[PDB]
């Protein structure tokens, strides 16, 4: 019985952990609630046997999860990828934080009526944020070196949404939109971002003040 | 012997705080003041952090910034993560339901609205409690016998929601049981009546919700 991971039809909290999935070819299903299917996760919500019941969900014939930061990590920690050492895990746990404080930036504004107006204090933040990545990346090929790591993932994802909110916020950083493109050319993330597998969008829910909508 | 740096607030930091004391820890912090921002800027970038930020933990093994690695790591070198990955999940699990209310409260606290917004996050937090007050059924605390990193997360949290309303813990008996419990364990109280102990501001001096130079 393979794990099934249960969330909104948007990328959300719950992209990087798809995209982990797909780069270990690990088969998983999908339980996935539209637009109009809010009383479907209603009917569902305490009826899986989840202590702290959520969206995005991940159960497997060991856990029942939710919070998307144990569903990536457990799934990462099933893989040996979580680090050998207290402090291999204190790096990719620094490197997953720094990510979701770009991620969670957009989001804590994202359903916000003034949202053009916060946009800017987050905008004029960005490029910092941004830079230590760029600089993170000088030397090392991915976020923790020569390998591949969850956050690396989460990078990806927050680099995707925060073009959409400003498409010229990686002009000056060159490494970031290499980066980019590498994730891209991994054979397993090429193949699911081309497949019928792929949301594009929404990226927050659908009447999300940016990043919502039916298309983009 | 460890440095912890960060404003002279609760803020992200007062878990690890307490943590570090409920392990009887030595550990120095450097405390930033309201009006030490430009001291803050200016140093930010020389002491070999690869994502300069508030709070940093330097000791003679690493050199981290996120709070979340921090308290994760200082529970790391104790052995409190979990033995295997369906138990790290479990306590990864506990942690982000704490953050979800205590960066509720985060979110809506900077804002000019946030009169407006406290009324639907107090109509929204009791179904977060409700999750923790079963959790805690049949737990002394929230994995269980002994203490983990989250039960320091979660007092937190729940010291931040009871300074937005004072009663809102009231119809969550085992919650209410479970701060005093916290208090109650003799290396907290020793800390809670400490030189030590910073009990104000909460988000920051300048913010609508927990700022100001005291309650
Ligand atoms: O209330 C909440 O659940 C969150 C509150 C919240 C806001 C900001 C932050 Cl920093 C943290 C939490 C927002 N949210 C979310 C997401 C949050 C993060 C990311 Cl990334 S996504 N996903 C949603 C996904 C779907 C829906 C929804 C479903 C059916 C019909 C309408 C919607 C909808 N109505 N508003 N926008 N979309 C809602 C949320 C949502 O509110
Ligand atoms: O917390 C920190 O700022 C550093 C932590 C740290 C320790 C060791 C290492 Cl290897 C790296 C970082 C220590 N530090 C420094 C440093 C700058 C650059 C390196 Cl490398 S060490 N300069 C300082 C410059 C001035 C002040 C200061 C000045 C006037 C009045 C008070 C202080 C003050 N009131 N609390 N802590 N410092 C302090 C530091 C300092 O702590
Ligand atoms: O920009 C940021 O740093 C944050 C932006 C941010 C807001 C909301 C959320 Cl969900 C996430 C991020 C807010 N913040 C914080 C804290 C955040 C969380 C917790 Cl818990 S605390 N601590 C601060 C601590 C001190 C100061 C500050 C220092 C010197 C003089 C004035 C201030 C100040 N100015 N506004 N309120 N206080 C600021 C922040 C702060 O903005």
Redesign the interface.
């Known amino acids: 019985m393979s794990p099934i991971l249960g969330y909104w039809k948007i990328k959300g909290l719950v992209q990087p952990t798809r995209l982990l999935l797909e780069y270990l070819e690990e088969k998983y299903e999908e339980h996935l609630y539209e637009r109009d299917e809010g009383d479907k996760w209603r009917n569902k919500k305490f009826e899986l046997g989840l202590?702290?019941?959520?969206l995005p969900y991940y159960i497997d014939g060991?856990?029942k999860?939710?919070?998307?930061?144990?569903?990536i990590?457990?799934i990462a920690?099933?893989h040996n990828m979580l680090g050998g050492c207290?402090?291999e895990?204190?790096?990719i746990?620094?490197?997953?934080?720094?990510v979701l404080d770009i991620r969670?930036g957009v989001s804590?504004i994202a359903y916000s009526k003034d949202f053009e107006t916060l946009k800017v204090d987050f905008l004029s933040k960005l490029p910092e944020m941004l830079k230590?990545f760029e600089?993170?990346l000088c030397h090392k090929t991915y976020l923790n070196g020569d390998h591949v790591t969850h956050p690396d993932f989460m990078l990806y994802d927050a680099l995707d949404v925060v073009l959409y909110m400003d498409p010229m916020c990686l002009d000056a950083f060159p490494k970031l939109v290499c980066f980019k493109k590498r994730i891209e050319a991994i054979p397993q993330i090429d193949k699911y971002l081309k497949s019928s597998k792929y949301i594009a969008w929404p990226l927050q829910g659908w009447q999300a003040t940016f990043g919502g909508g039916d298309h983009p």
Do not use: W
């Not at 999860?65 to 569903?71: E, G, K, N, R, V």
């Not at 746990?93 to 720094?98: K, Q, T, V």
């Open positions: 202590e702290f019941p959520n060991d856990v999860l939710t919070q998307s930061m144990a569903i990590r457990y920690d099933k207290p402090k895990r204190a790096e746990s620094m490197l997953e934080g720094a969670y804590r230590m600089d993170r």
